[PDB]
Design a protein around this ligand. Structure first.
Ligand SMILES: Cc1cc2nc3c(=O)[nH]c(=O)nc-3n(C[C@H](O)[C@H](O)[C@H](O)COP(=O)(O)O)c2cc1C
Ligand SMILES: [Ca+2]
Length: 169
């Protein structure tokens, strides 16, 4: 219950990643939530937060998330450790590949969120992305279940390892 996984999902992908993630961390470690059925209180509740957001319709944010953003910007993230994950399509929307991860970064970083979990952009092949920490790493875990589902298992296995460390446990 140290970690609170909050996801948005429209066709189920991010919802599954969240669940693989919690499996890997374990239950007494983290609880998963559908941001759509979540509240401010529900988010402020945890100290370590994992936020999952898939990018929709040309750089936009999954609507459950889009609509929660205002509440999101009311939360003081100062004193909190966050990580970010999401889903994207690097071949049909290569020019907005996981931009949503970037939008949720901007809408939380100034708020004092201590972000963790940058992921190497090695192995992906998008044309552009607004969710990059540096131009060799996304700001979070980018999962492409549409084009690279075969790499989804390992990406999560390794990324969760990576965050477990950065967070310490
Ligand atoms: C019409 C349409 C627009 C989309 N636009 C984007 C986009 O701008 N960025 C991106 O990387 N993925 C884009 N995607 C792909 C989704 O983010 C991807 O399918 C993701 O796995 C969906 O996760 P969800 O099931 O959790 O919503 C789009 C998908 C569709 C069908
Ligand atoms: Ca493929």
């Amino acid at each position: 219950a140290i970690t609170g996984i909050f996801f948005g999902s429209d066709t189920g992908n991010t919802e599954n990643i969240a669940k693989m993630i919690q499996k890997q961390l374990g239950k007494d470690v983290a609880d998963v939530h559908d941001i759509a059925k979540s509240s401010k209180e529900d988010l402020e509740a945890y100290d370590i937060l994992l936020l999952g957001i898939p990018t929709w319709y040309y750089g936009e944010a999954q609507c459950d998330w889009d609509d929660f953003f205002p509440t999101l910007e009311e939360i003081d993230f100062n004193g909190k450790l966050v990580a970010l994950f999401g889903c994207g399509d690097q071949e049909d929307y290569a020019e907005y590949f996981c931009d949503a991860l970037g939008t949720i970064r901007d809408i939380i970083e100034p708020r004092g969120a201590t972000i963790v979990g940058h992921w190497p952009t090695a192995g992906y092949h998008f044309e552009a992305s607004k969710g990059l920490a540096d131009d060799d790493h996304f700001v979070g875990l980018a999962i492409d279940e549409d084009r690279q589902p075969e790499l989804t298992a390992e990406r999560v296995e390794k990324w969760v390892k990576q965050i477990s460390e950065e967070l310490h446990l």
